[PDB]
Amino acid sequence: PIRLPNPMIGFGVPNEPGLITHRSLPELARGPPFFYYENVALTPKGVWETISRHLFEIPPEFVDSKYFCVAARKRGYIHNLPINNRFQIQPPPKYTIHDAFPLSKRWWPEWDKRTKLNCILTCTGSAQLTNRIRVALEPYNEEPEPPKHVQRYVIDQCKKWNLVWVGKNKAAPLEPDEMESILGFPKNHTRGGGMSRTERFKSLGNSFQVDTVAYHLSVLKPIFPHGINVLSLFTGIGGGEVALHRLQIKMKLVVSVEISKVNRNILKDFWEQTNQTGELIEFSDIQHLTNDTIEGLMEKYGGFDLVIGGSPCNNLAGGNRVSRVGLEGDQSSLFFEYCRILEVVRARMRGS
DNA sequence: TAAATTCAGATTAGGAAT
DNA sequence: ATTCCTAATCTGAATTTA
Ligand SMILES: Nc1ncnc2c1ncn2[C@@H]1O[C@H](CSCC[C@H](N)C(=O)O)[C@@H](O)[C@H]1O
Fold first, then answer.
1. Domain check: are A73 and A142 in the same one?
2. Ligand 1 contacts CB of residue A332 (under 6 A)
3. Longest dimension (CA), chain A
């Protein structure tokens, strides 16, 4: 059984001890192509064992993004990239809550000892929650400090819903612009393109932490001086593309497969607003992307140097009450579609 | 009718005491 | 091997707004 590492630093995170400069990966796992898989770390029993079983028995690298930004984010990363001489994109996001939220020290209570936020999710705290916290602390405004049972209801609910102090006895969740900044995207990366505020929360909560992924993909820069052809599966708002761009790694071609029309609009907007000289090809449903289509694309552009993607965590996340049924769930089973497309690439890149 | 609102527990792990 | 707590957690869907 996979035992999650404590601390969850993977092979090493910046400013922390325990950096592992070399690993030995099995023969069946070697590139080309380099590939990068991502999913949540806190899955039902025996999910990552199955994920590793279908990805050449590579032990997953579990890294909590609280070492890269202000919000925690526990994910597993299966990849065949070299782990030596990584680097972070500069400047790194704000580490603590005091720095990430300058105006919060005006309203933050002394008994809220949080210096770090929990995971950014797709479901945000409601306004009726902020009121129940406001009413709970109201009868103690003239007192220097509310009693203990009043404190830990507020404390536990702030941790439960990732609330920051925005007003007098007012604990509200994060705004989309704050989630963008914490997850490592530029400001207004998901604002336009027909994306409603409701949709912004969902696709942001589903996305990468760009600094964590960029720290991992950083080793690709000396290997490909002339750019890479990228096969992006489950693109979303383009976490991997933003990471590659911040690494100054030219993207000659990005074939993106993302079923959300608003997410594809976000990516195309990001493509033009950055003046990317390369070509962006956009596919929608991965279940209709045939193996011969991949072979035809690889023949035109000359194979993919990197296959990056993160399969749905619908049926793996602890927040899911309805359908947390594991890897065989309706959405998370698309992980085997990732293995299908990846296997086609390997057939041409390495053989057999 | 797109957008916004609201609330709906369980499954893990780990620590610590039997 | 049990019992008992703290603790985190890329969510679904019914319903109402507008
Ligand atoms: N059948 C399907 N075909 C292609 N993409 C799909 C799909 N079903 C779900 N997806 C997409 O897979 C994505 C997984 S969330 C991952 C998003 C990405 N890692 C990022 O950085 O933003 C979701 O955005 C979802 O839109």
1. no
2. no
3. 75
